[PDB]
Every structure is written in structure tokens, then in C-alpha cells.
């Protein structure tokens, strides 16, 4: 198992940008799909990217493409979101959660994944 805590949560104008890290601790970082979420006001958790094992792709929802981008650091066993040109309707809180165990199962969907951090919070102001 792995454990997984957010930083990088704050404020942000509209336009701006933001980055999201999370810092996995335990033994076998580069065998886990590790995932970004975010829960806004009043609706479900939403997935946002997913990087592969080997970090060789990684899957964007359509809400985000262009200006959110997962990269990872082994060595720092850390996964980073950046985000660019928020708009107020990326408030909301975000997550990251890991998967290591193989099958069937979805990359996007909360519910598909074992492990998951506390949560950071990002609002953009206008």
C-alpha cells in the first residue's frame, strides 16, 4: 500500500495558473496508476488524468484537456498537476488516488481506486 498527501492548494485569478503535487510514500511508486479527482460544490467526484505505470500515457478528461498536465518524479516518488488558464468553474477540491492491482476496472472513476490522499482545495477568483 501507499500513502498519499496533497500540496499545493491555494488561490488563484482567473488565467493564472496552479500546481498540485503528491507525495507518495512506500515501496514500489512506479507500480501504481496514480490519478487526479476534484469534487466541486454540489456535484460527484470527477476524474481529471491518469498516468500509466512507466508514465508512457496518461488520459485527460475532455473539461480539462490543453490546459491541465500530470507529470511525475520517481526519484522524489511525487505526481504533479499543473493546471493553466483556470477559470472559475475549477474550484473545487482536489484529490489524488493510486491503483496498483491489476483487471478490470476504469481510470476516470473514483470508485476504482484503493488509495487516496486528504484532499487540497484550489478557488479562482474573478
Known amino acids: 500500500q501507499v500513502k498519499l498527501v496533497e500540496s499545493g492548494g491555494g488561490s488563484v485569478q482567473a488565467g493564472g495558473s496552479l500546481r498540485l503535487s503528491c507525495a507518495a510514500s512506500?515501496?514500489?511508486?512506479?507500480?501504481?496508476?496514480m490519478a487526479w479527482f476534484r469534487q466541486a460544490p454540489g456535484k460527484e467526484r470527477e476524474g481529471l488524468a491518469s498516468v500509466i505505470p512507466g508514465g508512457g500515457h496518461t488520459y485527460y478528461a475532455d473539461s480539462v484537456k490543453g490546459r491541465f498536465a500530470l507529470s511525475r518524479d520517481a526519484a522524489a516518488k511525487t505526481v504533479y498537476l499543473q493546471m493553466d488558464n483556470l477559470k472559475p468553474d475549477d474550484t473545487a477540491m482536489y484529490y489524488c488516488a493510486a491503483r496498483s492491482r491489476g483487471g478490470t476496472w476504469r481510470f476516470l472513476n473514483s470508485n476504482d481506486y484503493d488509495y487516496w490522499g486528504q484532499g487540497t482545495q484550489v478557488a479562482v477568483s474573478s
Open positions: 512506500g515501496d514500489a511508486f512506479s507500480t501504481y496508476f
